[PDB]
Amino acid sequence: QVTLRESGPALVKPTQTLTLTCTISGLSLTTSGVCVSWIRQPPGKALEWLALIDWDDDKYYSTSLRTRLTISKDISKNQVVLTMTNMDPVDTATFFCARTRCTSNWGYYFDSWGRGTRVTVS
Amino acid sequence: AVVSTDEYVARTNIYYHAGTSRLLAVGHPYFPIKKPNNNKILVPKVSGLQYRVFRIHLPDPNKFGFPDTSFYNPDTQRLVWACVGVEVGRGQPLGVGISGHPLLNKLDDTENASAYAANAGVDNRECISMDYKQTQLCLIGCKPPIGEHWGKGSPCTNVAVNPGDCPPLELINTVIQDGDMVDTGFGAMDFTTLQANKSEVPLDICTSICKYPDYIKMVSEPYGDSLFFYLRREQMFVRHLFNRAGTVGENVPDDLYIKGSGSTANLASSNYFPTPSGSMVTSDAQIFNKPYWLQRAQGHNNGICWGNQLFVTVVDTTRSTNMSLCAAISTSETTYKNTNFKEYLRHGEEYDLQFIFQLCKITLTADVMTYIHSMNSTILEDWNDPLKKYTFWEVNLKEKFSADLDQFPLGRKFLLQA
Amino acid sequence: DYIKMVSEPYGDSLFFYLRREQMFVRHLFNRAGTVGENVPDDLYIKGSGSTANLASSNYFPTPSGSMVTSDAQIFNKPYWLQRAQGHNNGICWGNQLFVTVVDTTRS
Amino acid sequence: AVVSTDEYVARTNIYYHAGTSRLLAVGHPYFPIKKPNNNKILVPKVSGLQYRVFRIHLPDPNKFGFPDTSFYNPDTQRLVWACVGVEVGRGQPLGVGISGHPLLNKLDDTENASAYAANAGVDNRECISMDYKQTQLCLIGCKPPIGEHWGKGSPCTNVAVNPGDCPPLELINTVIQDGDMVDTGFGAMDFTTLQANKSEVPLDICTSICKYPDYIKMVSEPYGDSLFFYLRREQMFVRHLFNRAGTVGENVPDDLYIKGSGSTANLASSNYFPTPSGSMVTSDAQIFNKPYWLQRAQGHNNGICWGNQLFVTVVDTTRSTNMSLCAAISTSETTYKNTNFKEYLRHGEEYDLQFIFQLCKITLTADVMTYIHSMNSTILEDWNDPLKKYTFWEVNLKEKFSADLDQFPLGRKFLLQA
Amino acid sequence: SVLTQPPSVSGAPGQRVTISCTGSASNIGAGYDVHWYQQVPGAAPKLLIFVYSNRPSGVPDRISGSKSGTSASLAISGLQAEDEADYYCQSYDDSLRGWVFGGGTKLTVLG
């Protein structure tokens, strides 16, 4: 099985820096072909992909939030770290780290999803 | 270092002819008929696009009843049969067959489109046929032929690769077994384990490996046992240009097109594939019904048939005519009705292989023994079966041998040449 | 039956011959009728709706007598049988000769 | 004045064979697969319509471990490898591929119109395919090959030329890099910077330069280093006749037609273009699998491989068969569905280059040194890399050399010839 | 969102309801796959469709989809109480250079 569990500050204040952190188990980040993304969902709103990181250290971000986003992974912890800068109050949303399988076609997909963690900016 | 077999093998004026009486194989051209639930085949698949590899068996000269063995000394030397001449006779008239798939994956004829293609609505497969690539190749050797094909290897990624991802391409050698399928213009590949649609390719080769003789490997072989003479006269073209259906495995880069609108907004599938054609078949282009003399085999093995074996690979799509064969269910009806007649397809293949052999003697010096042992120890073990793995047309000539060349047509032709 | 005639012991049937036949698939067609040999189920994935009906796979070709030209003419030429393959070197036993002629280039 | 290299280079009876074991390249036939946003290619574009230029590297004879160097005096002369024979082996079966554009610019089939063409309503692009021009050309040299192509020059007017005006035609020389595209019947031109539509030409060459070997320039070169032997067997025809869509860049002169009325009042676009066709591919027309002897190179450079380098350009569209590769997203469904299978195209290319070299010696007189310096000073600098600019199939034969020709097939063929 | 969906659809138990996600030439027209996610509100999303009309593991066999023009479909035949969830189509877009989701159709099972 592939399991993901998110962690981070459930409460943050504006103009601060937010650092989510999603733990992967049953899978190794060193394996070629492995990718993980972050997808946030504001209260009662559609999902919005944020970033993608893969075994090859290649990184992707939403163009509108590219200037605010940086993603990485730590092999020692089998960990994925996401950092969003200059939090706005409207960023309040649930953040899901979902194992992206990186199929050949650029219509990638999120095979498995984490529990999701609420982040509130106020 | 390998040495020309001639360097140590001596030739003799003792010639012999031996060839099958009349080989004949008849069966379904597309697939092997069987029973409703068994693996008991009822009628074999006999198509003209098959490598009819004959594993000829020759009598052992050391245990052969020669009229007088004074020509060689058994106390210090042995004997082997050298293949001097071969004639692959063919009796059936020339004619190119046909094959097709009731549900060949073919979205539309992209050869010339009057209007943009419509939506690809669930299973647009079509009943399409085609006439396969023309091929005529004969291989003569003592080791079994080695072909080639594209199989499945280890994928680029090792992430328990995603369902339906790239099936990696691997080049795989393999012995060409009798009944295997020749490349038919769709490429040499193992459709069985490399194309799931089960619709990319016509029925008769849909679940079979399209092998091609690895001429480079066979020629570069150190001892050149696989073949010491060959020919190839294959040709074809794109009869039609078609398109595959399905989700796009590799989407066209966006720098590789300007986005469309409306009807053209949908990028049609770019997975184009050709429909081959067995173009002109003629007597002038006939490999067969001719005697080929192997006096100057490239190979270091100058025709010496080690182990009293000969492997004759024959491909002939210039006689692959599939003829119908309808049988009436009942003649009680005065008027034609479509369902009153059952449809049958049976392809007739006729072969008549002929040969000339020159007897040879091997002197067992220490160096000669060591060289032959290193080459193939199994040869020494015969004087002083690993091929059970492969299926071949087992053809026995041990009793067909005769010393009178003048009586047989190949013997007369060899006499006139020699 | 060129093989049989050539392998005949006395070679009386023929001692000289020629052949210049050729053609191709002008068109590709399909036979109608009930399927004598149904396609194995491992030899296709079942269809639905319109394609649910497996069309007849009894394909057959339509031949074509391609280019006929003077250069490809067997006839109007003298053939000398001085070197008949056959053991019968042209001897017409019984004062008989059998001359088979096929000519679709004037049909 | 240039002098036949023979005039001062001496030949020796010391021959050597060296050839790759088995070159193999596999990749997408149309475009280089990459990652969704990177310039990290994931699967290279391997098509049969590419100049597979091999930059062979030879061992330096002056620093080579010959069995005994008594044949030459190092104190006054050096050594170089002369290319005496080449065999471009090919293993893959013959078969012509296919390419197409989902939105090829094609208004209508003007080949035979039943009624006058209708209105050209915004983006009438079509999903059309074609089978490309057939080409077989092999070039052997020591300098890199030089092709040609039509690029963009300085326009006729210098008014900050109007948007969409004439793109001036310029003839531009350039070194043929490995992976570049051969002329495919659409003309040798740089579509990338010369066709803004991005739809005039099929996908696989839409954003690539169609180069053609500048035989005139290479032959007229003073030293003839670029090539000293070559062959060409290209042919094709107009499979179909089509028309381009878009506003008329050059309106038909009014003296060049009588005005129409009603439906014909609209002059249809006269920007006709042909659809090529790789006509019959056959064994008889095979350049490859044959040994070419360069004993009588036209060039003043009679095969001398200055710098221990060889450039072997190979074009082979007679084996360009593109083979699909469907993979199954899931076998849980009992019934065929179009979207259940992903479509993949992968073209397999196999090369096996073989060679024979005759060792040569150069005596360093004052005149000989001056001549060699003027020819190429870099040669002298080696005894007593500017090609990093171009990408070539880096093939190393420094350890593949062997003095036993009889062991290898090309060596045996050369023995039989020599 | 570049992709479009009906904000809400309803269907009584035993009926078949289709949720259509319409894109443009940049995302769905190019051929990028469409993926549907079933999400019970207040919980993590779940993978429901993996390719056009393709079923992941553990997904009921009655759910399917289709590919038609620049749009995709999510057909839920034999509706049940378990289908009381939102659904999002997902693909890749060429103008955005990133992955996108739909409008989140809110399916409801009628009494």
Side-chain angles (χ1 to χ4, degrees), chain D residues 6-7 11 35 51 59 67 72-74 109-110 121 138 143 164 175 192 194 198 213 229 296 300 309 325 342 374:
Chain D
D6 289 23
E7 295 183 40
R11 310 305 186 95
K35 271 190 175 95
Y51 288 95
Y72 92 101
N73 183 46
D109 182 11
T110 51
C138 168
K143 268 274 194 164
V175 161
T192 322
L194 205 52
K198 210 120 57 140
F229 141 76
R296 256 304 317 181
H300 278 151
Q309 297 187 133
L325 227 81
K342 266 191 193 0
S374 301

Side-chain angles (χ1 to χ4, degrees), chain A residues 54-56 58 60 103-106 108, chain D residues 33-38 40 42 342 344:
Chain A
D54 45 83
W55 84 104
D56 230 325
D58 275 76
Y60 311 76
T103 79
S104 274
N105 190 11
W106 304 158
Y108 291 178
Chain D
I33 277 46
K34 316 201 301 182
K35 271 190 175 95
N37 274 99
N38 312 344
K40 203 241 168 216
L42 278 169
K342 266 191 193 0
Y344 300 87

Side-chain angles (χ1 to χ4, degrees), chain D residues 159-370:
Chain D
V159 65
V161 179
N162 335 103
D165 216 6
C166 320
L169 277 286
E170 163 97 26
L171 195 42
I172 164 182
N173 281 116
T174 165
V175 161
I176 306 188
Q177 312 190 41
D178 170 35
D180 272 354
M181 291 282 180
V182 62
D183 193 317
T184 76
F186 281 95
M189 83 177 249
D190 162 31
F191 310 109
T192 322
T193 82
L194 205 52
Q195 280 181 342
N197 199 25
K198 210 120 57 140
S199 303
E200 309 297 294
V201 55
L203 205 67
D204 79 87
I205 87 184
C206 188
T207 62
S208 305
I209 313 103
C210 269
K211 288 214 262 273
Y212 187 61
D214 201 337
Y215 289 103
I216 290 167
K217 186 179 179 83
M218 300 219 258
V219 167
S220 306
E221 181 201 352
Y223 289 134
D225 294 335
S226 63
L227 57 71
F228 37 77
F229 141 76
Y230 72 88
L231 294 168
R232 67 171 88 81
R233 274 205 52 100
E234 72 198 281
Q235 69 263 47
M236 50 63 99
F237 60 65
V238 154
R239 154 92 68 185
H240 273 119
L241 299 141
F242 290 155
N243 211 42
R244 301 293 194 198
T247 168
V248 201
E250 274 78 79
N251 214 298
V252 194
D254 65 275
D255 58 279
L256 295 200
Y257 62 95
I258 305 179
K259 316 310 217 133
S261 62
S263 60
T264 169
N266 204 308
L267 199 77
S269 326
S270 66
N271 303 303
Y272 311 99
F273 78 101
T275 324
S277 160
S279 199
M280 276 295 340
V281 300
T282 166
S283 94
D284 300 319
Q286 280 297 307
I287 281 180
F288 309 140
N289 279 34
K290 275 119 199 203
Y292 339 107
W293 316 114
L294 323 189
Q295 62 180 339
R296 256 304 317 181
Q298 50 98 64
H300 278 151
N301 179 341
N302 202 2
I304 298 109
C305 304
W306 300 114
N308 319 304
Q309 297 187 133
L310 210 58
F311 287 91
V312 178
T313 300
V314 181
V315 169
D316 194 337
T317 81
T318 75
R319 290 174 176 84
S320 57
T321 277
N322 299 330
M323 45 192 233
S324 194
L325 227 81
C326 147
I329 288 136
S330 79
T331 62
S332 301
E333 300 199 303
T334 68
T335 169
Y336 187 107
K337 287 203 285 183
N338 234 14
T339 56
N340 210 76
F341 309 97
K342 266 191 193 0
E343 293 301 319
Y344 300 87
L345 296 188
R346 297 282 137 80
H347 164 62
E349 205 146 356
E350 176 180 4
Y351 286 115
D352 184 54
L353 328 168
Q354 304 168 34
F355 306 92
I356 308 293
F357 331 99
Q358 170 173 71
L359 187 56
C360 303
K361 64 192 92 176
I362 315 294
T363 304
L364 296 183
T365 64
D367 298 356
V368 167
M369 269 156 276
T370 297

Side-chain angles (χ1 to χ4, degrees), chain B residues 264-306:
Chain B
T264 169
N266 204 308
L267 199 77
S269 326
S270 66
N271 303 304
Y272 311 99
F273 78 101
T275 324
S277 160
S279 199
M280 276 295 340
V281 300
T282 166
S283 94
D284 300 319
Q286 280 297 307
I287 281 180
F288 309 140
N289 279 34
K290 275 119 199 203
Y292 339 107
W293 316 114
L294 323 189
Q295 62 180 339
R296 256 304 317 181
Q298 50 98 64
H300 278 151
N301 179 341
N302 202 2
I304 298 109
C305 304
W306 300 114

Side-chain angles (χ1 to χ4, degrees), chain E residues 21-103:
Chain E
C21 169
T22 297
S24 60
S26 58
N27 46 83
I28 272 165
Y32 307 127
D33 324 292
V34 152
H35 321 274
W36 297 82
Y37 290 114
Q38 156 138 216
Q39 150 157 266
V40 301
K46 211 211 138 182
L47 179 60
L48 194 75
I49 315 174
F50 159 102
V51 165
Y52 306 102
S53 206
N54 223 302
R55 203 172 298 96
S57 179
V59 163
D61 86 291
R62 49 87 182 251
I63 273 169
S64 66
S66 74
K67 210 269 196 191
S68 183
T70 200
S71 303
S73 306
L74 153 59
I76 302 162
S77 78
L79 242 181
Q80 290 187 30
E82 170 282 5
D83 277 278
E84 182 55 83
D86 295 11
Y87 298 88
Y88 309 102
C89 64
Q90 170 242 330
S91 271
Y92 176 89
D93 193 283
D94 261 337
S95 71
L96 273 50
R97 315 307 291 191
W99 294 259
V100 290
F101 289 88

Side-chain angles (χ1 to χ4, degrees), chain B residues 177-249:
Chain B
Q177 312 190 41
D178 170 35
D180 272 354
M181 291 282 180
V182 62
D183 193 317
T184 76
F186 281 95
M189 83 177 249
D190 162 31
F191 310 109
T192 323
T193 82
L194 205 52
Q195 265 165 17
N197 207 26
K198 212 123 61 141
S199 303
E200 309 297 294
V201 55
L203 205 67
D204 79 87
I205 87 184
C206 188
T207 62
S208 305
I209 313 103
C210 269
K211 288 214 262 273
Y212 186 61
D214 201 337
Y215 289 103
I216 290 167
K217 186 179 179 83
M218 300 219 258
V219 167
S220 306
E221 181 201 352
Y223 289 134
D225 294 335
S226 63
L227 57 71
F228 37 77
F229 141 76
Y230 72 88
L231 294 168
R232 67 171 88 81
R233 274 205 52 100
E234 72 198 281
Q235 69 263 47
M236 50 63 99
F237 60 64
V238 154
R239 154 92 68 185
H240 273 119
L241 299 141
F242 290 155
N243 211 42
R244 301 293 194 198
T247 168
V248 201

